[PDB]
Amino acid sequence: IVGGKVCPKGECPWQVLLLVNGAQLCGGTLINTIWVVSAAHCFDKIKNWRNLIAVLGEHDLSEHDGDEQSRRVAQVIIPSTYVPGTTNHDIALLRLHQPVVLTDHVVPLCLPERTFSERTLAFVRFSLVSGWGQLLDRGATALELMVLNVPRLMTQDCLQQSRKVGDSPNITEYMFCAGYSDGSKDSCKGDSGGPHATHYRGTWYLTGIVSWGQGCATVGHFGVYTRVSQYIEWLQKLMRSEPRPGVLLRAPFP
Amino acid sequence: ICVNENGGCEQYCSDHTGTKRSCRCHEGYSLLADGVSCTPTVEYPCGKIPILEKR
Ligand SMILES: CC(=O)Nc1ccc(S(=O)(=O)C(C)C)c([C@H]2CCCN2C(=O)[C@H](Nc2ccc3c(N)nccc3c2)c2ccccc2)c1
Ligand SMILES: [Ca+2]
């Protein structure tokens, strides 16, 4: 997170830290006690599927305060439409080996209905983005969980407001823009898979996932987030499904 | 009716045959008699921050 602030301990209770061999990998969002929503591109370089850990109740990476809960990632479900090495359909649904215990520091984010997400949540200007990723372009990652408020932009405005850099991927119907073009405020590669959370009438919902962009807080470039509203039915059917042997599972999309 | 101002609902909205509208809530919430408000039924409902709610 570039240009954000430290998310006060316990104020981003749905935030997940994804580790592979004890090393920082990505963020995620807890949506209930056994499920976490992240980005598919987080797992593009995974060889050691048994060494995937999700940490809930995390805040400060240098100190253990007893509020952290670690769980082995039992399953990583990625849509059939996700091509590794690309940007489209950048979502992953993770099943934790055993549920997390809900505490003041471990709370799920609401996964909204397609209807409410599209016709209501899509029009809330400002939404919060979080993670222990880079604090600057080509700089160090955060020790304490950071948060940033970002304005959502319509795709036509996002195409019009951005510096036409070649070889850049297209913004699809399964993604959206949020952030600033001045190079002051963004989420970056270390925040990948993390939440873009939206407040509506005293409750927060999952609307996007830290997915991709140009460099890190690059001038004339916005941040690109997975349009979670397209995956509600997909996530729900799978959440009702029996576990399959194996960590990586590819599920049909739609 | 739901497409306009979430149909009055605090959370979820269903359109019915005619000028009928049904508000609903996410799991861990019950709907109030006003038919729009959602109240938590659990200790840790989603989308609520306990340190901020207990303040
Ligand atoms: C396509 C592709 O490069 N794939 C890919 C697969 C895997 C990996 S990884 O193995 O390291 C994994 C563990 C994160 C990676 C890692 C290493 C290279 C970059 N990267 C990212 O994740 C980048 N993420 C973001 C996310 C939000 C951004 C934002 N809001 N603003 C600006 C830039 C932003 C960049 C990113 C940039 C451009 C496209 C996709 C991701 C990439
Ligand atoms: Ca800690």
- What is the phi/psi pair of residue A148, to 5°? -140, 140
Which residues have a Cβ under 8 Å from the Cβ of A121 and sit 6 or more positions away?
A112, A198, A200, A205, A207, A229
Q: H/E/C letters for each residue in A155-223?
A: HHHHHHCCCCCCCCCCCCCCEEEECCCCCCCECCHHHCCCEEEEEECCEEEEEEEEEECCCCCCCCCCE
Q: Which amino acid is at B30?
A: S
What are A42's two structure tokens?
């987080």
**CA-closest candidate to residue A26, choices A12, A13, A37:** A37
Q: Is A45 in the pocket of ligand 1 (CB under 6 A)?
A: yes
N-terminal to C-terminal alpha carbon distance within chain A: 32
Report if residue A250 sits inside a domain: no
Indicate which technique resolved this structure.
X-ray
DSSP characters over B4-30 = SGGGG-SSEEEE-SSS-EEEE--TTEE
Residues of B in Cβ contact (< 8 Å) with A106: 44
What are B12's two structure tokens?
């979820």
What are B35's two structure tokens?
């038919």
* Contact at CB, A10 and B50, closer than 8 angstroms: yes
Question: Measuring from atom 18 of ligand 1, which residue has the nearest CA?
Answer: A189
User: Do A6 and A128 belong to one domain?
Assistant: yes
- What is the phi/psi pair of residue A246, to 5°? 115, 150
Distance from CA of B17 to the nearest CA of A (A): 17
Report if residue A239 sits inside a domain: yes
N-terminal to C-terminal alpha carbon distance within chain B: 35
Q: Distance between alpha carbon A120 and the CA centroid of its chain, in Å?
A: 20
- What is the phi/psi pair of residue A173, to 5°? -75, -10
| A167 annotated binding-site participant | no
A189 C-alpha to ligand 1 centroid (Å): 5
Q: How many helices (H) and strands (E) would you count in chain A?
A: 3, 14
Give the separation between CA A130 and CA A125, rounded to whole angstroms: 17
A10: left (phi over 0), alpha (psi -120 to 50) or beta: left
User: Do A123 and A136 belong to one domain?
Assistant: yes
- What is the phi/psi pair of residue A190, to 5°? -75, -20
Query: CATH no. for residue A200?
Result: 2.40.10.10
Helix (H, G, I), strand (E, B) or coil at A120: coil
What are B15's two structure tokens?
């359109």
Distance from CA of A109 to the nearest CA of B (A): 5
In order of A113, A144, A186, B10, the CA distances from B27 in angstroms are 12, 31, 32, 14
Asked if the C-beta of B47 comes within 8 angstroms of chain A's C-beta atoms, the answer is yes
Burial A147-165 (b: 16+ CB within 10 A, else e): bbbbebbeeeebeeebeee
Strand-pair partners of A90: none
Q: Is A69 in the pocket of ligand 1 (CB under 6 A)?
A: no
Contacts of residues B33-37 at CB distance under 8 Å and 24 or more positions apart, as own/partner, are B36/B8, B36/B9, B36/B10, B37/B10
Which residues have a Cβ under 8 Å from the Cβ of A85 and sit 6 or more positions away?
A44
Look up residue A49 and give its DSSP letter.
G
Helix (H, G, I), strand (E, B) or coil at A235: helix
Question: Measuring from atom 17 of ligand 1, which residue has the nearest CA?
Answer: A189
What are A31's two structure tokens?
């949506």
- What is the phi/psi pair of residue A56, to 5°? -105, 155
Q: Please, what sign has the CA dihedral across residues A55, A205, A112, A186? A: negative
Give the number of other CB atoms < 10 A from CB of residue A38: 30
Domain count within chain A: 2
> Active site includes A97?
no
What is the domain extent for residue A67? 13-108+230-243
User: Do A7 and A122 belong to one domain?
Assistant: yes
Helices (H), chain A: 114-119, 155-160, 232-239
Residues of B in Cβ contact (< 8 Å) with A200: 6
> Active site includes A90?
yes
Q: How many CA atoms lie within 13 A of A96 on its CB side?
A: 25
Closest ligand to residue A9's CA: 2
Report if residue A27 sits inside a domain: yes
What CA dihedral angle connects A242, A204, A72 and A60, to 10 degrees?
180
What are A98's two structure tokens?
């055993």
Strand-pair partners of A54: A18, A71
Query: CATH no. for residue B49?
Result: 2.10.25.10
User: Do A100 and A127 belong to one domain?
Assistant: no
Give the separation between CA A113 and CA A87, rounded to whole angstroms: 24
User: Do A170 and A95 belong to one domain?
Assistant: no
In order of A27, A43, A160, A206, B27, the CA distances from A230 in angstroms are 20, 21, 24, 12, 20
Residues of A in Cβ contact (< 8 Å) with B39: none
Burial A218-254 (b: 16+ CB within 10 A, else e): beebbbbbbbbbbbbebbeebeeeeeeeebebebeee
User: Do A193 and A121 belong to one domain?
Assistant: yes
Asked if the C-beta of A25 comes within 8 angstroms of chain B's C-beta atoms, the answer is no
User: Do A118 and A169 belong to one domain?
Assistant: yes
What is the domain extent for residue B12? 1-55
Chain A, window 157-216: residues with a beta carbon less than 8 angstroms from a chain B beta carbon: 200-205
Nearest-5° Cα angle at A236, A13 to A128 = 30
* Contact at CB, B50 and A107, closer than 8 angstroms: yes
